[PDB]
Amino acid sequence: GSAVPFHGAHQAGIATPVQDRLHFAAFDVTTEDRAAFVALLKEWTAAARRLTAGHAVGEGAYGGLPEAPPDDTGEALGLKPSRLTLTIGFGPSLFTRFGLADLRPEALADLPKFPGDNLDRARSGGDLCVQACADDPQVAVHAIRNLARIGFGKVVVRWSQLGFGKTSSTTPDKQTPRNLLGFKDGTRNIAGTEKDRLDRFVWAAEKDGTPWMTGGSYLVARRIRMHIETWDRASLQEQEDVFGRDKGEGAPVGKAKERDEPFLKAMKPDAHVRLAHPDSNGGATLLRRGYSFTDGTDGLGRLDAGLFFLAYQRDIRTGFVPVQRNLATDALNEYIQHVGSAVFAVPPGVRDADDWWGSTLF
């Protein structure tokens, strides 16, 4: 139920322990007035400080003027902060507005087309994002709803994704969660305690070429549908061969324990772990922070199931792109399809109570 500190050199919600629930929203900007957009970023920051502390936005949820709408929509009254983090990102499309073209980071690379892609343009892209993670889904929804309300007339929601359950880990001391294929997902990630690895692979540095982004990160979001019907008729051995780990313990093939180090040459050459491992990718390492979803049925008699894949990295060109390219032959591709995509520059942290989201850019 505790609060995660909002202020810092970095935004919370990245290295932070992974919370149980996600509500991710991509927004498009509808104002061409830079000053109004700045005002919104300031108002949003003020609301975020309230929300992440378990407090109502503005003057509260009730007890104001009877004739006015309440400042806060009220559905989180009486609830704990629930480890809420709110993380903002700017998409490549934002830099076409407000005189920002020259400030677009080179590290904010457009993704190439990948084999097998079937991207829904309506559930892709976005001028900006807000990642709301918390242990209570009502707290997360309340946060996105109230930010959207404050932003009426200046931003609209383009698309959103709820995650019902995490599929990622930044805390190796705690149980690794399973994805809907039934395998632990998150064993070999980057932990929040690994400052050296975070500096090497996740946070942008000044020398990288874009000063305003120092202490920020770059996010890739990929909506991935899972072919559950096909997977569920696969043998146990086929399933384990796809990954290169056993299903029960999640140990590397031939080994006894989950966290024993992989011996890659014992895996099939198309195994997911073998292809995705840093040693197969010139050392490229990601912070994975995704969640599972189910969006009803497919209309054809089956449950829908997928994974909303989130990866943070110091540079898209040296993180997601090389790794995903190396997955072109992945055995897992028979059971998945990427159906949505977006990239964002995640700015540095809000340093103190006088700072605001995006201040280093604007």
Q: Which of residues 300-339 bind ligand HEM (CB under 6 A)?
A: 306-307, 309, 320, 323-324, 327, 336
In DSSP terms, 10 is beta-bridged to none
Distance separating alpha carbons of residues 272 and 140, to the nearest angstrom = 32
Give φ, ψ of 132 to 5 degrees.
-110, 115
Among ligand HEM, its own copies, none, residue 32 binds (CB under 5-8 Å by kind): none
Give the end-to-end CA distance of the chain in Å, rounded to a whole number. 34
Task: List the one residue from 31, 93, 160, 359 that touches its own copies (CB under 8 A).
Answer: 160
Helices (H), strands (E): how many in the chain? 7, 10
Was 55 annotated as part of a binding site?
A: no
Site map (CB under 6 A) of ligand HEM, residues 193-232, x = contact = -----------------------------x-x-x------
Distance separating alpha carbons of residues 92 and 100, to the nearest angstrom = 10
Distance separating alpha carbons of residues 11 and 260, to the nearest angstrom = 32
Site for its own copies in 51-110 (CB under 8 A): 61-70, 73-80, 82
Task: List the one residue from 51, 130, 198, 276 that touches ligand HEM (CB under 6 A).
Answer: 276
Q: Does 135 bind its own copies (CB under 8 A)?
A: yes
DSSP for 179-202, please give it.
Answer: -TTS-B--TTS--TT-HHHHHHHT
The residue (of 62 and 263) whose beta carbon lies closer to its own copies is: 62
- Binding region for its own copies (CB under 8 A) out of 38-46, 142-150, 187-195, 282-290: 142-150
* Positive/negative CA dihedral, 212, 222, 15, 204: negative
Residue 274 C-beta: closest distance to its own copies, Å: 19
Question: Which residues contribute to the site for ligand HEM (CB under 6 A)?
Answer: 179, 181, 183-188, 222, 224, 226, 243, 245, 262, 272-273, 276-278, 286, 306-307, 309, 320, 323-324, 327, 336
